Design an enzyme around this catalytic site. Sequence first.
Site, PDB file in Angstrom:
ATOM      1  N   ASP A 143      10.377  10.822   3.094  1.00 26.02           N
ATOM      2  CA  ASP A 143      11.467  11.405   1.781  1.00 26.02           C
ATOM      3  C   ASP A 143      11.889  10.238   1.537  1.00 26.02           C
ATOM      4  O   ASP A 143      11.442   9.346   1.511  1.00 26.02           O
ATOM      5  CB  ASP A 143      11.686  12.783   2.036  1.00 26.02           C
ATOM      6  CG  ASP A 143      12.010  13.495   0.426  1.00 26.02           C
ATOM      7  OD1 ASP A 143      12.131  12.974  -0.542  1.00 26.02           O
ATOM      8  OD2 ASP A 143      11.975  14.974   0.849  1.00 26.02           O
ATOM      9  N   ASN A 188      10.533  11.117  -8.937  1.00 21.19           N
ATOM     10  CA  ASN A 188      10.781  12.116  -7.065  1.00 21.19           C
ATOM     11  C   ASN A 188      11.824  11.457  -7.409  1.00 21.19           C
ATOM     12  O   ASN A 188      13.385  11.818  -6.871  1.00 21.19           O
ATOM     13  CB  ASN A 188      10.228  11.962  -6.546  1.00 21.19           C
ATOM     14  CG  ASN A 188      10.870  12.638  -5.186  1.00 21.19           C
ATOM     15  OD1 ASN A 188      11.344  12.428  -4.754  1.00 21.19           O
ATOM     16  ND2 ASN A 188      10.211  13.741  -4.806  1.00 21.19           N
ATOM     17  N   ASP A 241      17.144   4.654   2.694  1.00 25.34           N
ATOM     18  CA  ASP A 241      18.020   3.877   2.395  1.00 25.34           C
ATOM     19  C   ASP A 241      18.473   3.041   2.928  1.00 25.34           C
ATOM     20  O   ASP A 241      18.652   3.045   4.550  1.00 25.34           O
ATOM     21  CB  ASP A 241      19.361   5.011   2.019  1.00 25.34           C
ATOM     22  CG  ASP A 241      19.878   5.214   0.340  1.00 25.34           C
ATOM     23  OD1 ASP A 241      19.674   4.213  -0.433  1.00 25.34           O
ATOM     24  OD2 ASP A 241      20.737   5.973   0.167  1.00 25.34           O
ATOM     25  N   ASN A 259       7.591   8.989  -2.880  1.00 26.49           N
ATOM     26  CA  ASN A 259       8.824   9.845  -2.768  1.00 26.49           C
ATOM     27  C   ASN A 259       9.746   8.826  -2.458  1.00 26.49           C
ATOM     28  O   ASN A 259      10.489   8.242  -3.031  1.00 26.49           O
ATOM     29  CB  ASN A 259       8.617  10.983  -1.233  1.00 26.49           C
ATOM     30  CG  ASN A 259       9.487  11.379  -1.455  1.00 26.49           C
ATOM     31  OD1 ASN A 259      10.830  11.696  -1.999  1.00 26.49           O
ATOM     32  ND2 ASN A 259       8.969  12.696  -1.472  1.00 26.49           N
ATOM     33  N   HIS A 265      15.962  20.574   3.420  1.00 26.52           N
ATOM     34  CA  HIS A 265      15.324  21.965   2.186  1.00 26.52           C
ATOM     35  C   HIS A 265      15.452  23.373   3.595  1.00 26.52           C
ATOM     36  O   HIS A 265      14.420  24.008   3.270  1.00 26.52           O
ATOM     37  CB  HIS A 265      14.286  21.319   2.085  1.00 26.52           C
ATOM     38  CG  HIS A 265      14.083  20.586   0.970  1.00 26.52           C
ATOM     39  ND1 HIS A 265      13.052  19.582   0.226  1.00 26.52           N
ATOM     40  CD2 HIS A 265      14.954  19.598   0.394  1.00 26.52           C
ATOM     41  CE1 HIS A 265      14.034  18.934  -0.573  1.00 26.52           C
ATOM     42  NE2 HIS A 265      14.270  18.962  -0.742  1.00 26.52           N
TER      43      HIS A 265
END
Length: 312
Positions: A227, A118, A230, A173, A285
């Site tokens: 998800d 992923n 960083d 993820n 999304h």
Amino acid sequence: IPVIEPLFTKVTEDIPGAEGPVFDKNGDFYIVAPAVEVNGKPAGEILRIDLKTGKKTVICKPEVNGYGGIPAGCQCDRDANQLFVADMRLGLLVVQTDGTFEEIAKKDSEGRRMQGCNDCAFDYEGNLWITAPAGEVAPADATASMQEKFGSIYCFTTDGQMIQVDTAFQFPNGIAVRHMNDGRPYQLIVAEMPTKKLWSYDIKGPAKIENKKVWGHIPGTHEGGADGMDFDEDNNLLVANWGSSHIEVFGPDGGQPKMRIRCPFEKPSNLHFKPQTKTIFVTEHENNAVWKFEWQRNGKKQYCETLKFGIF
Ligand SMILES: [Ca+2]
Ligand SMILES: [Ca+2]
């Protein structure tokens, strides 16, 4: 928990499953479209985006022996003009920005078939830490660890070893590596999406992680969770909390978010800083688009922004 509401600017749209935002050594911007399907079958794309106009250019639509890929995460290589791509159906791919790709491995260091990947994160030593929430790569039938705990974590070393460093995750993820100021990697953070948890490990060396523990808690009981992630230059960890309409901000010590960033959409999937800036590009999304906003500071340098020979 303090919440900020920065002004978001729409960058581009119509990218099915918009994910893996990344910048290469030349400053070009790319994103992946894992949700693209042709005749109901996976046909994911890797795209280059024109930051000025939002124009999208297909650079690669990977497929192996009749099986289309589902590219979902990316990392820039420091020593070559190629992208390392985590693919949910094909595993780990190395994509040349010019239009060709190679499958890094069909089996791991123990000879087992690769699991679909992923996202991934390069540590400053060149080792690639990868999340693999999917089942065996094609041609095996597709499956996901959203319910069952069979998701794994890999580390593809600089010497070519594809090592499964851990497993039993419920859809791992996002992933990130924390470094000391001398460039030494010392902590790995893995997002376990549905469980709303962030896990940490001490990194002792290439493919060597220990002292596993629950490091942070993702707010909400909504479908989704952490998800992509960083670090910013102060080592604060920004995490897209898919389904929450927010990007969580964790301090160096984890626990509960120190701050939340409200998004003009409910499903942030990933993010990436523009080198030498406070600009963060976000894929989502809800509208399958890419946006950008200004954070409080610059982002942590990515592996391909680091000095190969060190500070002269
Ligand atoms: Ca992801
Ligand atoms: Ca990123």
